[PDB]
Design a protein around this ligand. Structure first.
Ligand SMILES: [Mg+2]
Ligand SMILES: [Mg+2]
Ligand SMILES: [Mg+2]
Ligand SMILES: [Mg+2]
Ligand SMILES: [Mg+2]
Ligand SMILES: [Mg+2]
Ligand SMILES: [Mg+2]
Ligand SMILES: [Mg+2]
Ligand SMILES: [Mg+2]
Length: 207
RNA sequence: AGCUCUUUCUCGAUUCUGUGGGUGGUGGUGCAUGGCCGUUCUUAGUUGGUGGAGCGAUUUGUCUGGUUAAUUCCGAUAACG
């Protein structure tokens, strides 16, 4: 937003640079060109943070406008985003899908997995292409976290970030939960949040 | 074989004559058919409902790979059941 209550604070830029979310890929595509600051001395692109923040608050403003919280289905297929989507759906009452997608869940009126969402959030356009291709049949908008080499086909609100590393992905889902819960009422601003981002990170099997 | 011929007793309305019409047939057609059987074919093969691809005949599901006597399973997965 244009305001000052919605502006990025110094405590969040440290969370960003600590998770590494500013660090892009090696290849750029001509649709993500407005989100890049400059290519490093070695071949890697820096993502502009102020632009990440504005696209993240636009996604939150798109999610808050849906009345029933339970038709904002969230999807992750890679192993890094499963815990994050499960915790995001818990914190704000969406319906998560981790693992395989079982094509036809959006367009098949027999299956027991058939639902009719009203939004669609997704971790990675290039790894969860089946939900996008199916959303392209039932008038279904889409929000997506994009790496610097993400194809922006059928996505409607791309959020630029490092999409590869587990810490980055969990931090982005945590911040998306923070800002929907903030502007819906609920956990009012001028307080830190009870949950720490590490509840949202990938497990990466332990000792 | 009263089959027929010579001869002339016996039976009793059941027949006989003619016209229609039936009846029977190990007669014809298995290239008019039912049913049964044999064989393709002793192997692992077949099919539709909703969804996806194609203008369409069609295709996916019914599979790269491993496994099994086996489309038997494990799995992979625009398919689900
Ligand atoms: Mg006859
Ligand atoms: Mg006969
Ligand atoms: Mg015959
Ligand atoms: Mg016959
Ligand atoms: Mg069809
Ligand atoms: Mg068609
Ligand atoms: Mg077939
Ligand atoms: Mg064998
Ligand atoms: Mg299986």
């Amino acid at each position: 937003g244009a305001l000052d209550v919605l502006q990025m604070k110094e405590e969040d830029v440290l969370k960003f640079l600590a998770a590494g979310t500013h660090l892009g890929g090696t290849n750029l595509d001509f649709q993500m060109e407005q989100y890049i600051y400059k290519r490093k001395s070695d071949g890697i692109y820096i993502i502009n943070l102020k632009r990440t923040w504005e696209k993240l608050l636009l996604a939150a403003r798109a999610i808050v406008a849906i009345e029933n919280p339970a038709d904002v289905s969230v999807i992750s297929s890679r192993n890094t985003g499963q815990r994050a989507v499960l915790k995001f759906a818990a914190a704000t009452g969406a319906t998560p899908i981790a693992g395989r997608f079982t094509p036809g869940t959006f367009t098949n009126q027999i299956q027991a997995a058939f639902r009719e969402p009203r939004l669609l959030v997704v971790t990675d356009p290039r790894a969860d292409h089946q939900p996008l291709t199916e959303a392209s049949y039932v008038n279904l908008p889409t929000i997506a976290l994009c790496n610097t080499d993400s194809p922006l086909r059928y996505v409607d609100i791309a959020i630029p970030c490092n999409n590869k590393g587990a810490h980055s992905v969990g931090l982005m889902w945590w911040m998306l939960a923070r800002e929907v819960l903030r502007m819906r009422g609920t956990i009012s601003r001028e307080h830190p949040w009870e949950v720490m981002p590490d509840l949202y990170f990938y497990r990466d099997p332990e000792e």
